[PDB]
Amino acid sequence: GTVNWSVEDIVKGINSNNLESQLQATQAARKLLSREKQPPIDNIIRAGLIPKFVSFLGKTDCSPIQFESAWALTNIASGTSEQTKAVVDGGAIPAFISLLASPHAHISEQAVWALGNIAGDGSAFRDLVIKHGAIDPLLALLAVPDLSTLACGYLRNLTWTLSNLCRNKNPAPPLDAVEQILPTLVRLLHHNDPEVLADSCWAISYLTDGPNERIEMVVKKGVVPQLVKLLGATELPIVTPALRAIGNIVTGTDEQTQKVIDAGALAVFPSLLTNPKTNIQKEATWTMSNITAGRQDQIQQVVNHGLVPFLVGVLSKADFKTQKEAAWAITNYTSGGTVEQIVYLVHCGIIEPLMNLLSAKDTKIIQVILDAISNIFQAAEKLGETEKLSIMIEECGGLDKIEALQRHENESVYKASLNLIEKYFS
Amino acid sequence: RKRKFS
Amino acid sequence: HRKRKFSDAF
């Protein structure tokens, strides 16, 4: 009936002065736009059909044409930025916001879906959706005593659309929009559906990626213990954004970092630092690096949790990106740590894997490692044990690597390597 | 992210 | 030593 229609036939049906012919033609366009292989989105746009679909959204008297036109427009808005712009330029944003209050659940859900796609395009469309007043009717759909009474797919779509209103930077979402969304987001973060949990975590990871004032808004809502619980989930789609949010929070103040430690996050790091997914090990090591960039009592918590042997592990063997983050974690630890904490790092066997990484063809990691060597020597200087460290570096072949770096192309590497040779190996 | 309704 | 935000690390 409405399967495999040409664009010409769809246009003829939509241009008829017959509501049923228009409905049949709109359903045919929806089915064309829903096909797996190459839907003709540009052909539908070029035929001038977006203004027709947008007017059909306002036909309260014909709920099937509202649903078919909403679905057709959701498929166009899900495309490229130019395709999402064509939907916005057709006036679809206020028309979809009016459909959020529809008595038909499948229509309201379609409007939620469409607005998530529009807001998801970037900062300008996200902020334009917010200015048209989408937040109040979106939140009203979730204002129920128990989230469990809502249809599963409907709740997942609402969570995903809210996560897109939290997404993107330059600029970050408006402060008052974030404050308005946050209580519902905290509630979704305690829901038991894995997809709702993943998208709630992604939303929180977006809101905590920026200035420390942005982190504060989130941390003040008391979400850190729930994020640490999700950090220990078995589902990789949940662990990934929960680790990103935790990693983002520890880029903040010493106080914000302390909330992550107090909630018991460090107890999860033996498994995260050995996780079979390289992106988990990488982002877990980045998180560790920002904790070792903290206070001496915070470095001590890393020590007490037995995480220094786990840092020796990732520095010894891991994908190069994780090893570079491990090098940062060590340089941060040696910069802020006490002599006792730095001595403990050497006793855990940091020197040999730190030296082996001086062979890497990455100028940034070389600078980071040479800075760590200098900090370890400064601690050894305070104990008069520089000779014991010099022999250790010589024995694992570290001396040959530092000597070779005296003829390096980079200025900072050349200067730091010549400095170590003259001060401790002459 | 964007998502099509298939 | 100094905190690194997500975009400054990757």
Swiss-Prot record, chain A:
GO terms for molecular function: DNA-binding transcription factor binding; nuclear import signal receptor activity. Keywords: Acetylation, Cytoplasm, Nucleus, Phosphoprotein, Protein transport, Repeat, Transport, Ubl conjugation. Residues 71-167 are annotated as: NLS binding site (major). It comes from the Eukaryota. Disulfide bonds: none annotated. The keyword Ribosomal protein does not apply. ARM repeats lie at residues 1-40, 41-80, 81-122, 129-173, 175-211, 212-251, 254-293, 296-338, 339-385, 386-425. Slightly detected in brain but not in cerebellum and skeletal muscle, highly expressed in testis and spleen. GO terms for biological process: entry of viral genome into host nucleus through nuclear pore complex via importin; positive regulation of viral life cycle; postsynapse to nucleus signaling pathway; protein import into nucleus. Residues 244-332 are annotated as: NLS binding site (minor). The keyword Iron does not apply. One of its GO terms (cellular component) is host cell. It is found in: Cytoplasm; Nucleus. Ubiquitinated. Deubiquitinated by USP22; leading to stabilization and increased activity. Consists of an N-terminal hydrophilic region, a hydrophobic central region composed of 10 repeats, and a short hydrophilic C-terminus. The N-terminal hydrophilic region contains the importin beta binding domain (IBB domain), which is sufficient for binding importin beta and essential for nuclear protein import. Heterodimer; with KPNB1. Component of a complex containing CSE1L, RAN and KPNA2. Interacts directly with CSE1L. Interacts with PLAG1. Interacts with APEX1 (via N-terminus). Interacts with FRG1 (via N-terminus). Interacts with ARL4A, CTNNBL1 and NBN. Interacts with ANP32E. Interacts with SNAI1 (via zinc fingers). Interacts with SNAI2 (via zinc fingers). Interacts with BAG6. Interacts with AIFM2; this interaction likely mediates the translocation of AIFM2 into the nucleus upon oxidative stress. Interacts with RSL1D1. Belongs to the importin alpha family. Functions in nuclear protein import as an adapter protein for nuclear receptor KPNB1. Binds specifically and directly to substrates containing either a simple or bipartite NLS motif. Docking of the importin/substrate complex to the nuclear pore complex (NPC) is mediated by KPNB1 through binding to nucleoporin FxFG repeats and the complex is subsequently translocated through the pore by an energy requiring, Ran-dependent mechanism. This is Importin subunit alpha-1. The chain holds residues 72 to 497 of 529 of the full protein.
